[PDB]
Amino acid sequence: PGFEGGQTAIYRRLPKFGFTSQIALKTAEVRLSELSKVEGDIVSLETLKAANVVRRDQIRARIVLSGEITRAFTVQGVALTKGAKAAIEAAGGKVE
Amino acid sequence: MRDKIRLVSSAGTGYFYTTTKNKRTMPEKMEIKKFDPKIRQHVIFKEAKIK
Amino acid sequence: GSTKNGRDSNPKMLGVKVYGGQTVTAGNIIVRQRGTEFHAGANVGMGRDHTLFATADGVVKFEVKGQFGRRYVKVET
């Protein structure tokens, strides 16, 4: 596969670009709706890992506005987008 | 034969253009006014080695 | 022996692209020509390579006009 009869291949006649970031491998993304799986009112990295929405080897997490939540939460040490923060406040939670 | 050369901004931003010249007919160093994107103004540019 | 010929150039695909009575949009190329076989009228622009293009939306029309009798292409809105 990738042999075209002798003519320079597609993957060899194009340039290489970019580099790999180490911290991106340990950074984790979390949808807003997944907080329902959390047991309890405290949302933290440890609680997310316990709920199995974040892998154990990750070192930080981010929450994005993807779904909907019908519960009250308190977020500790987790980055929130503007929309996710607004949704949490509307649902009746708090940050820090 | 024509030789490649660099025209460096006088402003010190490091911006440079690249062109060619005939050494026999143009021994002198090249002046020219050109636009510098970094400082967004028209300034003088000096001939220099393409290197 | 051998022959000193045997060379040719690649094709260039020249000619008319939109014919009279058709509809065009601004920017559509109408004529590909090496020289100015056709000239530009209203709403038609000329490129550096003598290409004729439409600068407005409408209907293409060919005509013969002038003392020289040269051919013109224009766009009617």
Binding site: G2, I10, L14, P15, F17 | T20 | -
Partner: protein, 63 residues
Amino acid sequence: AKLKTRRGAAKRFKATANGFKRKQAFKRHILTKKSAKRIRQLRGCVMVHVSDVASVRRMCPYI
């Protein structure tokens, strides 16, 4: 066994929402003679052509 990736292709192709992005050629070393329009228009990323998408899929199964 597990399928193995073609690392040479993995270093040239990245995945988008509906396809693959790539960089363009003819911008490495010979640039003085090239026009400014070509210099600017050859910059940036483009999309892989549909005809060649299949080979990229074969060479990069897990991306």
